[PDB]
Amino acid sequence: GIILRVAEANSTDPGMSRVRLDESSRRLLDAEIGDVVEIEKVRKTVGRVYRARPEDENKGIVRIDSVMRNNCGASIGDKVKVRKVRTEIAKKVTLAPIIRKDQRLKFGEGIEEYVQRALIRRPMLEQDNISVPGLTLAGQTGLLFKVVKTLPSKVPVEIGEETKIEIREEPASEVLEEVSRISYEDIGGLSEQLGKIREMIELPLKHPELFERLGITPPKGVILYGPPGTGKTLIARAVANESGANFLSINGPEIMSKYYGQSEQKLREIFSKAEETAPSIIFIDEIDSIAPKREEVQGEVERRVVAQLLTLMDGMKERGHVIVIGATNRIDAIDPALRRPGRFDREIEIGVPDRNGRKEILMIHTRNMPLGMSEEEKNKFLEEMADYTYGFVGADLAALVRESAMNALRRYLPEIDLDKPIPTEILEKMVVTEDDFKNALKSIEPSSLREVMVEVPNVHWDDIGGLEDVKREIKETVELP
Amino acid sequence: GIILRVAEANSTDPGMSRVRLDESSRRLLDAEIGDVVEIEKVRKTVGRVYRARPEDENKGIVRIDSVMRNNCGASIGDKVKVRKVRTEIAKKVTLAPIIRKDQRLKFGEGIEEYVQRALIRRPMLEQDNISVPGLTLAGQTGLLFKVVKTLPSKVPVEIGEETKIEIREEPASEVLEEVSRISYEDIGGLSEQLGKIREMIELPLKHPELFERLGITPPKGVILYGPPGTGKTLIARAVANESGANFLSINGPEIMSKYYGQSEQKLREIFSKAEETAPSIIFIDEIDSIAPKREEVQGEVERRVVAQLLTLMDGMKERGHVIVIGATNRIDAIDPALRRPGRFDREIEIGVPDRNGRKEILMIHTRNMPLGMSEEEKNKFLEEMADYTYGFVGADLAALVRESAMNALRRYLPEIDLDKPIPTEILEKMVVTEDDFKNALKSIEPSSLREVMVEVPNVHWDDIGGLEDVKREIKETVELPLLKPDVFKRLGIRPSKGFLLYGPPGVGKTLLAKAVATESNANFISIKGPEVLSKWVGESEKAIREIFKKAKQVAPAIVFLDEIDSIAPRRGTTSDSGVTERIVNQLLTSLDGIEVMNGVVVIGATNRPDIMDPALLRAGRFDKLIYIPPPDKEARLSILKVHTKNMPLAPDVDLNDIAQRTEGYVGADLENLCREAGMNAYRENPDATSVSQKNFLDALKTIRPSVDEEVIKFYRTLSET
């Protein structure tokens, strides 16, 4: 009714509070375009956004930015109350750093330059955390600032271009929901698969009694595939962020450091926390190390660690309200008995991206820096980078652009400013020309070891010549059924 | 006398107390149809059922529902006293939850909706547990309610549609025999095998002195095969339910958690309980983990755990009155010495289901939900789901429908009710459309890794065309030895394997041999080139020897073997020469040593034979060729009407003119011409070739006439020579 949905923003609008609202969705609320919005939901957490119309989306959902959902702690399908309010402008705003794992923060100037041009008329309120990326991939990422006081406090305000900004720099922590959480929009990859993997554990993990025995038996286990730690492993820790439950980490360095009698007791030790932290999710990326077994002799510790993990899941009635999942590099390095009942049943194969899927993966790593989608229509758009790149992955793309960031460095940083204090002039000098990403394509970094791949062509019938007799005949065969 | 048997209900009647009683069985008791029944047996446990007549069953047994046998604790072949009584109706009934492992139960409303429409006039008594499934597969299963008090208590009552139902919700336990027991009807799978596996341990486990040394030595051990934990392992715990004895569980997590000195003492520890809990049954599904041994070095613990298990069975005199059994995934991962005497002897191979066998497996997982058999005759019936599904198993089918239940969820649950309290309106909204089960068939979930499989065809002689000379000739070969044999001994003719076919691929030839399997009501075993190329890549070429031994139990069945010899000539020249290949000689030598007189019928086919052995022409092997002529005018017209009966009919298509001009088209061409030109026939599409007879003639000029007199002459020369 007023209840308009939250979702993962396709068009990101890297400037926060710019959240897309449909023209057909806003006329359902009878709120016109270009007004200050008040987002009010349960827990009495609030935030303000600016309406801008997308196209492909329909009135069934409203597609919202990640951080503004990370400010209200919104999960997909929540309940909010939004309406248009009065419009004002700020005067002088004071901000403060958010220090938890950050180890202090930026020292020097840029209190005006970096903040002002990135404001772009963001509706907001006092004590709100704004996310302002840009200026580079390495050293500058999505960064949250704690706003102390503005002169028009608690009232709806859009900070203008002629309004000064003061940075107190006094070290403090976040008032509202800082990072270490990764939203589904902060995630990127296969789209429909992201919703299909989550929907099975969606309803149980939220509430136990919402979906328990009703529809079917809940998930026993889930086996994941693909580049384990390209950001496929980041999805594991990411899924536990929206659910809010505990995340148990079964990792390489612990199973390698624990030999006979140390690991055997640790298997029940991590399982003892599974019953205590319950409800909790159990993610194992060590299936390659734990149970590589093809039925040979890897030693007693290898057969002991797998036999216990089988009994650890068997020792559970399947109700502590917990879900054990697993991940591995490829379709191989897995124990064949894991597909037997009484243990892991569902296996979800995670594939690779496509020309459109790569753009979703790139969009995650697209903005730490000063790039744009609508603001550069073609030259810096991701599809021009997608068509040349073949057989890559998020971490490879992340390390590729980071190596391509050094191309932006070697043309700027070393021969100009070697000083530890960061000048204010070097900030305007930071941009990214497509040549930096093209120079990495010519250099040897690209490698594709992937056996199975797919593609889609660019070829239309405008470049096709004669033989129209087969043309309509090809339509006869293929297109009719 | 009054003693009418209990059995496993084929027609389930998911509504309890609806138990099927034969019309011929009820007239033996002189009790008419549609009356209240009083079931009285030993221990003075009672229950009431409603009589409804089935058909195929006879008066020898009465086929009874599972839960009503689970209420009286009935085992197959018990003694009961049943008679017709007076008929009354309830007024107001009070029910209570059964809480043991259940962790409380349903909270909200539905005390009327869910109960009332599922009552369907069930005869019952006070303090009886009724089973009411439905509304979904996941979250709702067979559920028992404890009835506290009804106003007409202890008297025969059929709760009516206008009678209210009250749920006290006060937590309590079962008065009578709740779940955690799985009846043979609750079991599903191979039918005759379920009775054959149980009958050996049936008599001993019931009473020790009933059958002890009398007939034979009791079972030493039993080795089980198949998907260990698809519900094949559920059978293990299930068998111990009817017997009532103790069930010892040898499992994976305990043998993995117990290392050197922990497991070695545990082997005698679980064996010490075997003597204490005696009589008891010992089921081991860990034969894969315990004794995988092919005689290599798996470590000392692997040789120690198997050597003890050998002595654990040897340490027993064979009388504690106990039976040790075992199970494993496949015919492999087993110790070779286990077949030696002094230890496991009987091995019962558990296979996979069939179109009828799958319906029995589905019937177990069919009702947690609101489906029906007689109430939906076709659309929701299991056979429509069975014909599309191939190479599945109970747990795979259970997880498939559970994933297909999410299709029923995604169309209902998320976008409507996310609330923890369950509304009363969402209960009517729960149904299952066949599209949910079809969407999983299109999605990638189906996978078949199973090497050896069988099937049965749908093809009858109504879709078959001409060549009736071979028709009665196929009946001559195959169908005569079955009914005749006392006539077969009158003539005293020798035995033989079977005929052989030749002709262009799949003209009628794949359909003709496929039609004979349905008429004789026998099974169908197909060995085909693309089917064999799957075998010898996955190392199943040795299992072909087992497929030979597989045909004798499934008999009567026909064996259909085509183009295995196609890979013979590449290594050495074979047509009449007979130098074939190393794996193919396993086919040859077997046909020489395989016993005749069996229900197996050897059949083969090929385009032009041109690959064979001179032994394949000799007897005890492939036999007299059957010439497939090209369909004549009267044969083509009979074939064309089979192709055009599914397509629309109109004078625009004339079958007479094309039949007179073309005498040489085979079955594949006639089957092909309707494919692409039938899309051009009438209006399937805007193109201008529609509603013409020339569209068949236009494709007639493009396709080859397939008229070769030389290859037909080559057949007559190779046949006699």
From Swiss-Prot, chain A:
One of its GO terms (molecular function) is ATP binding. ATP binds at G226, P227, P228, G229, T230, G231, K232, T233. Optimum temperature is 70 degrees Celsius. Keywords: ATP-binding, Nucleotide-binding, Repeat. It comes from the Archaea. The keyword Repressor does not apply. One of its GO terms (cellular component) is intracellular membrane-bounded organelle. Belongs to the AAA ATPase family. CDC48 subfamily. Homohexamer. Forms a ring-shaped particle. This is VCP-like ATPase. The chain holds residues 6 to 486 of 745 of the full protein.
